[PDB]
Write a protein that binds this ligand. Structure first.
Ligand code: PLM
Ligand code: PLM
Lengths: 191, 182, 174, 156, 178, 169, 131, 475, 182
């Protein structure tokens, strides 16, 4: 029976598009959103929903591909499902951004005031760098990529963005992950 | 030639990201758009056309600034410039031209790669009404209007519609005589 | 300062009193009959936006084939003015016939009969205006033309269609 | 070499044209031809417009003036005067500074053979009926044209 | 030493012709708060003098002759009697002492006459050029007669005839004296 | 040593202006607008009037105002000579204490830089103005808030332009 | 191989196939085994922690299970004693095919899988690996 | 609440049962008392009962609770293996009565299962080779001189009481007591005179004077007759309860304790010599003196039938009066040895042990620590009649309903711990088998319970599956 | 500067000619002018003023060519260019400036070294109404008009009339408006 998706492989096709092309597509995504939603909240949550779709795919993509040493022919072990919050956030740091933006995330910072909060920081946001000003609402797309990426793994969240310029980096963005209380309760029960 | 200039410009004078991100983003956009419009795919096609037009009207500036090519003396040269450096920079693909109609007014672009349409199967309601890469049609029309080459652009074949190979008709209507005073 | 810049151009036959229409509307304050363009400005507040209407005034047979080509291309609004004198009103037909060659269709177009003090007919202007979907004025030098200018600015701003719309003192894991 | 040479009076009128054509040492062209009048007006306007720009962006020392106006096709030069006589000179990109040549042309051809010539009508304005930019009186002194073309020959 | 510019004196010497024409005109616009006088320009004045009727032209020419008479009659403040007008009088009045001097009748032939160095008309009107530059010669005629006047020679015993057809404007001047 | 940079749209009208010297703003923004529109007018008249007799490529200057260039790889934007695009339009304006340089694009969008140095100067100017055009393509086209011909309101564009002119000036 | 199924986090089957009475009772056996599958989900060492393998038995119908990274549960009523490596390989193959299915941008996470290509290919995989 | 109104919960008052299994076990392993001629005729004249045995059978169980309004007794006819068929027909008739009678089911199923379990325990041979719990221990000879009877009647009755009969039994062991009635007054005085003569010469004596009824724990056979269909005076009920209390606490229990004293002093089919310690253990169990019972059983390690029963009741003694460890080392290994003995006797040639230990585990405090063992034994009996095995399925469903971790009582935390889905699956299995042995109210109750866990899902809920088939079945 | 520029031009560029000859020339010109005027001196002054206007109109072009000065908006610049360069070139006198009235619309130029009236002594009849160097006033009027500084200039003192010195009042009337085409 004919079909393409199940026949075409999914090993990493090491081929690259222009940053400008994706930047223009992102620009029109934001503009078309702006055309048809009144307030900032609706705009930014819709963009985070686009990111939600992207992330819910991307979790399976990255997790399956990291398994390797018709790709199931090559796999002798699958990567362990990420249970603890530390391991999944380490994966988001060292593999999700290393894949998506070609460089490991700057640093993974666990909060101190509130416990369920966690922080992942970008020095030079590699996708929204052309949006003028510091209207942070633009990069909720990336938040969505985190949200869905966490959400299927079993970690309901309310991920959001803030701009905290520091250290001679005018564009620094901190994405804060706010785990639901039940997630920390499961962390308490097991482990 | 155009080949060497486009190759160098893509190689070490433009930024590189992972194409999976680009195709996934476009898939998210078109999927949500299809859901929004009550599966009415005529409206989806028109909205994607308007989208692509709006990208192309700006992307012409980036293309010219990055490449800085002279004026286009004839439609054949526009086709070679397109297939050999334009898609080579942005999408990193080399389309082709295979239908040179009489007067050389029309030409059919061939998208053997089409990274926009990776991992896509269409719903059975969309199989006969929706063109997936229509943004890449609106872009061509909008960008070629900003160089006064007014062109009607549409799709004929599409692999996602089951065809053998996707293609995009580009028919130049009329060179606008609102060209820049120079 | 200004955040939006819109372009209007007022044109008509040579002997028409174009300047008296502009100056009362104009800003605080050459280049006409030299490059074919007299420029006026008015800042206005539209939905809290400081939008400037820049008005271009042109004429001249010796320079017609340079006025028409370049100063029409990106117009956000067009105004036709004719004095109540009849040759100008007849010329308004060829005017409206040669505007659309360079000006895009979606540019607002407005018509004015100027300098009353009635040696031309009145109903003919109204019906010819209604033929081409033309907001028409029958005025003399103010005379509420500024109100129509502000209305046109409002319509262009609408056509733009742009909606306006954690201490983190944590510890690194590396 | 040089492509043309124009003299405009302060009353917004063109009073001398010289349009070298074949680039010979004594190339045949047009002198005070009516055909250039439209072009004359255009040139005047261009100069006038740019003069206005240079009057706007003055530092404060002196109300200054335009030296060169280079398009993609040619390079213009101009040496204005207090009396309001614009001495325009078109040329190619071969030479850039014509200031000495313009100064010499003003100081020992126009001054010698037009200012100091009682027969020659200075100011070339009959009356108000043409003075305000209209009227096409030109300068046609034998000595002026002869010596001007004689001196200007080696650069065309 | 006594020194002044040269263009001023040279063009004033040129302008003594419109003097004579204007005075013979107004014998019969620009304003002052007390003088709304009726004025006439210069070049129109010389065109009128050329176009003027005859008898007025003799009167104007005699006026210029008298002007030059008074100009030269007192040239005795810098230190043959005829040759006084040739040796250095033209070295001050015009700078160029006359190139050709000869005697027996006295002919004085010069080239590149100074004050008319710039007076060429439209290119097609050479005959009007000479016919209109003619009156400027009379200033030297008055000068030579006046210098001869009172300097041990009778004014009436000599009549000075000036013209120019000799070999920018190389039509040199020729004077004959007794 | 540039003292002002400003850009103009196809319609005819200023869309961005910025000085770099100490308080040269003796002109209103309205006055700068009129100045730019008169530049457009004399562009329209300076190509219409060409010599009856007549009825090129910019060499790549190495590091004009240089040393991630937005979306451009490499330590400089480009490394080969390119071509002029306004063939018979106004290109320079020398003046007794400054020198204005003007650049044009196929899309009818115009750049102006007013240097105070007072042909190699034109070549260096078009190189620098191509750098500024690259910045325009980066931080003004990849902005969804920007309306296509209304004035620029980008801060990254301002920072990059000022960085370049301080590299030069 | 008595029954195979793929169930989502909402606990609805995105896809079930009945290989060729118990034919009526199979889904309830499956939905009952879901609880022990979830119990072994969160336990380190339940060494990949997705191939759970044998989870429950009901009259000797040894249910076996496997969990995807997105929480989709691949679980089947076998029957008997099952082989580790072959069942794991089949689970890997069907997981890869499901991942390819998930890429379809028109696909919802809750939409039942209805492409006949997927059905035919998992059938062929089973006959390669189980029969 | 009222223990009577849980064993007969179907005679509105739904609450939790406290520790009911232990009370049931004691109530079925209580001392047995006989009840005996012109006297049953007197009752039939007065109260519509065929014989006095039924009338006193309506006063079974705990005396101190005053059951009709801590030590139990049960009554049996005069003096003179797992018959699961009787149990099955009991279940069928009981369920038919329930259908005719009943409306929340949430405790009816619990009560019906507990009554099932109770009868399952008492369903061995009525006079076992070992299990002395069914032996009569106090023979209540009854007379009423007020009708006209006389001393010689009691003489002959006791004479006939003194001893085909079994070998284990020993008539001297059983303590006789003379119930003398009267209908009020001088009859009471001559009753005292006869009591004096009997006590001096023969035994003891009990003076007895002379709204509905809901009995329990008679035996397997009387309930069948009960299911094929009275009132009495409240003062009479109180008088009966008081005289039973005097008998049980001042005539029987003291005799029990004297007997136990003699046994334990003398301890430091078969009928004597080794019958001593086993009956001592049996009556130690009978009186809730558990630890001495366990010690006596442990000393008893000397056969196909006796040894298995001894080990079984040793384990039951441990259960009846509790951490993981002793279960790992004492209870379950003891039960396993009991099994091994039972399959050995089968090889020579059980269910009661399994259905007892299941509830005994299920009654413990730490539900999470040991419910699994009860599930294991119940599953071991699933390997008996159908209609009872349905109740066993229901019981496994109830057991799996209580395998939630105590440390919890969206919802991501709770998913991996609760086993509610298995409970729903077993409830549906019970519903199916109820549909087989066509019983519409039972399947109705089962589906009513199922609806909570199975309403949210839709694929299961669709037609073509047993949910739809059974929902349309009840129409 | 204006001073050094003027001295350079006068000393190095322009040559020499006798002052006394020029004074005799003006003596002859004014004498023969007033001869035919039957001693009427108001008409003489008017005609001399017209002469001076016509003189300055043509002399100004040679002036501007000799130097390289731009226009001047304010009358102060007219003062420095007149005192330092114009007179200092054309007849080599450095007249002073005084009597700067309010608004700087008037100023008096003092011409002590006036060679026009150097040794000439007037008769008593002439002293009443003759203005000897009125040609200078006419020249200043014509030249300042030629620069677009419309002006009125006439005498305030003359040594010949027995006044304190030779001084002329230059009085602005209006700065002329630069024209534009119609
Ligand atoms: C001659 O005048 C040259 C002009 C040619 C313009 C070419 C425009 C290139 C468009 C390429 C397609 C871009 C697709 C990516 C955007 C989403
Ligand atoms: C502002 O720039 C003014 C222009 C420069 C001054 C023009 C005045 C020149 C007139 C000089 C006349 C001198 C008298 C000569 C003897 C007759």
């Amino acid at each position: 029976i004919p079909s393409r998706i199940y026949s075409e492989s999914l090993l990493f096709k090491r081929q690259e598009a222009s940053l400008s092309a994706m930047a223009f597509l992102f620009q029109e995504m934001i503009s078309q959103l702006h055309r048809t939603c009144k307030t900032a909240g609706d705009f930014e949550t819709k963009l985070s929903d686009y990111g939600h779709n992207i992330g819910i795919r991307l979790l399976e993509l990255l997790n399956f591909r990291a398994s390797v040493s018709s790709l199931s022919n090559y796999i002798t072990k699958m990567r362990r499902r990420d249970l603890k919050i530390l391991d999944i956030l380490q994966f988001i740091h060292g593999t999700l951004w290393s894949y998506l933006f070609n460089h490991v995330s700057d640093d993974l910072v666990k909060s101190s005031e509130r416990d369920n909060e966690y922080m992942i920081v970008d020095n030079f946001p590699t996708l929204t760098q052309f949006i003028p000003g510091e209207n942070v609402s633009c990069e909720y797309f990336v938040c969505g990529i985190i949200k869905g990426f966490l959400f299927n793994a079993g970690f309901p969240c309310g991920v959001t963005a803030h701009r905290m310029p520091q250290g001679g980096h005018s564009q620094r963005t901190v994405y804060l992950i706010q785990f639901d209380r039940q997630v920390l309760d499961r962390e308490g029960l097991r482990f | 030639s155009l080949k060497a200039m486009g190759e160098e410009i893509w190689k070490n004078k433009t930024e590189k990201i992972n194409t999976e991100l680009f195709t996934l983003t476009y898939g998210s956009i078109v999927a949500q758009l299809c859901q929004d419009y009550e599966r009415d795919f005529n409206k989806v096609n028109d909205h994607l056309y308007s989208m692509g037009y709006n990208i192309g009207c700006r992307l012409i500036e980036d293309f010219l600034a990055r490449t800085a090519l002279p004026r286009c003396e004839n439609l054949v040269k526009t086709s070679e410039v397109l297939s050999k450096c334009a898609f080579k920079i942005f999408l990193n693909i080399t389309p082709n031209i295979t239908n040179w109609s009489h007067n050389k007014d029309t030409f059919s672009l061939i998208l053997d790669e089409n990274p926009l349409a990776d991992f896509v199967e269409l719903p059975m309601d969309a199989m006969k009404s929706l063109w997936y890469s229509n943004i890449l049609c609106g872009v061509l029309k909008g960008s070629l209007e900003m160089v006064q080459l007014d062109c009607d652009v549409w799709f004929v074949s599409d692999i996602l519609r089951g065809d053998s190979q996707t293609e995009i008709k580009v028919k130049l209507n009329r060179i606008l005589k609102d060209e820049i005073p120079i | 300062e200004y955040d939006y810049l819109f372009k209007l151009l007022l044109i008509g036959n040579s002997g028409v009193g174009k300047s008296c229409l502009l100056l009362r509307f104009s800003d605080d304050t050459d280049y006409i009959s030299t490059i074919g363009v007299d420029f006026k400005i008015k800042t206005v507040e539209l939905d809290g936006k400081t939008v400037k209407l820049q008005i271009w005034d042109t004429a001249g047979q010796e320079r017609f084939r340079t006025i028409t080509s370049s100063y029409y291309r990106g117009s956000h609004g067009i105004i036709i003015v004719y004095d109540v004198t009849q040759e100008s009103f007849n010329g308004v037909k060829m005017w409206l016939q040669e505007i659309d060659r360079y000006a895009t269709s979606t540019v607002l177009k407005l018509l004015v009969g100027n300098k009353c003090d009635r040696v031309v007919e009145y109903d003919v202007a109204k019906e010819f205006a209604d033929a081409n979907k033309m907001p028409f004025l029958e005025t003399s030098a103010s005379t509420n033309v500024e109100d129509a200018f502000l209305t046109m600015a409002r319509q262009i701003k609408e056509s733009m269609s742009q909606q306006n719309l954690v201490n983190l003192k944590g510890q690194s894991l590396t | 070499g040089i492509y043309s040479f124009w003299i405009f009076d302060r009353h917004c009128n063109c009073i001398f044209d010289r349009e070298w054509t074949l680039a010979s040492n004594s190339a045949s062209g047009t002198i005070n031809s009516k055909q250039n009048e439209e072009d004359a007006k255009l040139l005047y306007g261009m100069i006038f417009s740019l003069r206005s720009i240079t009057q706007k962006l003055s530092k404060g020392s002196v109300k200054n003036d335009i030296r060169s106006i280079s398009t993609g096709k040619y390079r213009v030069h101009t040496y204005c005067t207090a009396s309001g006589l614009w001495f325009v000179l078109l040329s190619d990109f071969k030479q850039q500074s014509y200031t000495q040549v313009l100064q010499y042309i003003y100081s020992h051809i126009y001054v010698k053979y037009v200012s100091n010539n009682l027969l020659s009508p200075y100011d070339f304005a009959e009356n108000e009926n043409e003075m305000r930019g209209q009227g096409t009186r030109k300068i046609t002194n034998r000595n002026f044209i002869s010596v001007l073309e004689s001196f200007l020959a080696p650069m065309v | 030493l006594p020194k002044v510019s040269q263009s001023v004196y040279q063009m004033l010497l040129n302008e003594m012709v419109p003097l004579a024409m204007g005075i013979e005109r107004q014998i019969s616009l620009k304003i002052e708060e007390h003088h709304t006088v009726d004025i006439i320009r210069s070049h129109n004045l010389i065109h009128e003098l050329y176009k003027a009727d005859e008898e007025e032209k003799e009167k104007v020419l005699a006026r210029l002759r008298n002007i030059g008479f008074q100009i030269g009659l007192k040239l005795s403040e810098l230190l043959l009697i005829m040759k006084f007008i040739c040796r250095d009088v033209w070295k001050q009045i015009f700078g160029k002492q006359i190139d050709n001097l000869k005697t027996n009748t006295f002919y004085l032939l010069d080239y590149d006459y100074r004050p008319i160095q710039s007076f060429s008309l439209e290119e097609d009107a050479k005959n009007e050029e000479l016919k209109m530059i003619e009156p400027f010669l009379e200033i030297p005629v008055g000068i030579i007669r006046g210098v001869l006047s009172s300097l041990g020679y009778s004014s009436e015993e000599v009549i000075c005839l000036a013209s120019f057809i000799d070999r920018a404007f190389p039509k040199g001047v020729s004077f004959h004296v007794q | 040593a540039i003292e002002t940079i400003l850009v103009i749209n196809k319609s005819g009208g200023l869309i961005y202006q910025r000085n770099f010297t100490n308080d040269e703003q003796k002109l209103n923004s309205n006055e700068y607008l009129i100045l730019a529109s008169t530049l457009h007018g004399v562009f329209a008249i300076a190509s219409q009037l060409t010599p009856k007799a007549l009825q090129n490529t910019i060499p790549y200057i190495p590091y004009v105002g240089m040393s991630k260039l937005g979306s451009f790889k490499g330590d400089d934007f480009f490394k080969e000579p390119f071509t002029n695009w306004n063939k018979s339009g106004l290109r320079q304006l020398c003046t007794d204490q400054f020198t204005m340089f003007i650049y044009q694009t196929l899309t009818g969008l115009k750049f102006v830089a007013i240097s105070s140095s007072v042909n190699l100067a034109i070549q260096i100017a078009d190189n620098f103005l191509r750098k500024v055009y690259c910045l325009y393509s980066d931080y003004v086209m990849k902005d969804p808030s920007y309306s296509m011909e209304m004035p620029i309101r980008s801060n990254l564009f301002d920072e990059k332009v000022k960085k370049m002119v301080e590299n030069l000036q | 191989p008595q029954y195979f199924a793929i169930i989502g986090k909402k606990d609805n089957p995105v896809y079930e196939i009945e290989f060729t009475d118990l034919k009526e009772l199979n889904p309830f056996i499956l939905h009952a085994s879901l609880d022990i599958v979830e119990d072994l989900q969160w336990q380190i060492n339940p060494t990949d922690n997705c191939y759970l393998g044998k989870v429950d038995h009901f009259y000797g119908l040894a249910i076996t299970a496997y969990i995807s990274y997105s929480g989709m549960k691949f679980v089947m009523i076998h029957g008997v004693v099952i082989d580790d490596n072959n069942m794991r390989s089949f689970y890997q193959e069907v997981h890869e095919l499901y991942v390819k299915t998930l890429m379809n941008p028109f696909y919802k996470i809750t939409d039942p899988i209805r492409s006949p290509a997927f059905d035919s290919r998992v059938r062929t995989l089973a006959r390669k690996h189980l029969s | 609440f009222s223990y009577e109104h849980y064993m007969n919960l179907l005679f509105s008052k739904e609450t939790v049962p406290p520790e009911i299994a232990k009370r049931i076990i004691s109530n079925a392993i209580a001392p047995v008392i006989t009840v005996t001629p012109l006297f049953d005729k007197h009752i039939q004249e007065t109260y519509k009962v065929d014989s006095l045995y039924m009338l006193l059978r309506f006063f079974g169980g705990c005396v101190s609770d005053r059951d009709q309004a801590s030590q139990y007794i049960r009554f049996t006819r005069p003096l003179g293996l797992f018959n699961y068929h009787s149990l099955e027909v009991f279940l069928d008739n009981y369920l038919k009565l329930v259908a005719a009678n009943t409306v929340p089911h949430n405790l009816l199923k619990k009560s019906i299962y507990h009554s099932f379990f109770s009868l399952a325990i008492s369903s061995t041979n009525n006079l076992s080779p070992y299990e002395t719990f069914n032996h009569p221990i106090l023979s209540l000879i009854a007379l009423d001189i007020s009708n006209g009877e006389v001393y010689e009647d009691a003489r002959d009755l006791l004479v006939n009481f003194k001893n085909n009969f079994p070998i284990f039994m020993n008539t001297n062991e059983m303590l006789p007591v003379f119930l003398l009635c009267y209908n009020d007054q001088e009859e009471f005085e001559k009753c005292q005179a006869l009591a004096k003569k009997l006590k001096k010469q023969l035994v003891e004596s009990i003076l007895l004077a002379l709204q509905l009824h809901q009995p329990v724990m008679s035996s397997l056979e009387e309930i069948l007759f009960f299911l094929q269909a009275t009132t009495l005076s409240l003062a009479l009920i109180n008088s009966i309860y008081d005289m039973l209390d005097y008998l049980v606490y001042d005539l029987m229990i003291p005799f029990m304790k004297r007997k136990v004293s003699f046994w334990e002093e003398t301890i430091l089919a078969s009928s004597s010599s080794e019958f001593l310690m086993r009956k001592l253990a049996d009556w130690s169990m009978m009186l809730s003196d558990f630890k001495t019972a366990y010690s006596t059983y442990e000393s008893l390690m000397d056969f196909p039938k006796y040894l298995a029963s001894c080990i079984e009741w040793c384990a039951v003694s441990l259960l009846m009066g509790v951490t993981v460890k002793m279960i790992k080392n004492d209870i379950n290994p003891l039960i396993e040895r009991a099994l091994a003995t039972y399959e050995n006797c089968s090889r020579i040639q059980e269910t009661r042990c399994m259905i007892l230990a299941s509830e005994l585990f299920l009654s413990l405090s730490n539900t999470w620590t040991s419910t699994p063992y009860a599930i294991q034994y119940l599953e071991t009996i699933l390997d008996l009649g159908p209609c009872s095995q349905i109740m066993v399925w229901e019981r496994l469903s109830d057991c799996y309903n209580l395998r939630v971790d105590p440390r919890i009582k969206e919802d991501i935390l709770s998913e991996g711990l609760t086993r509610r889905r298995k409970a729903a699956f077993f409830r549906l299995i019970a519903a199916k088998k109820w549909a087989e042995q066509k019983q519409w109210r039972q399947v109705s109750w089962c589906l009513k319970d199922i609806e909570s866990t199975y309403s949210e899902i839709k694929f299961l809920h669709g037609n073509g599956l047993i949910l739809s088939k059974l929902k349309n079945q009840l129409n």
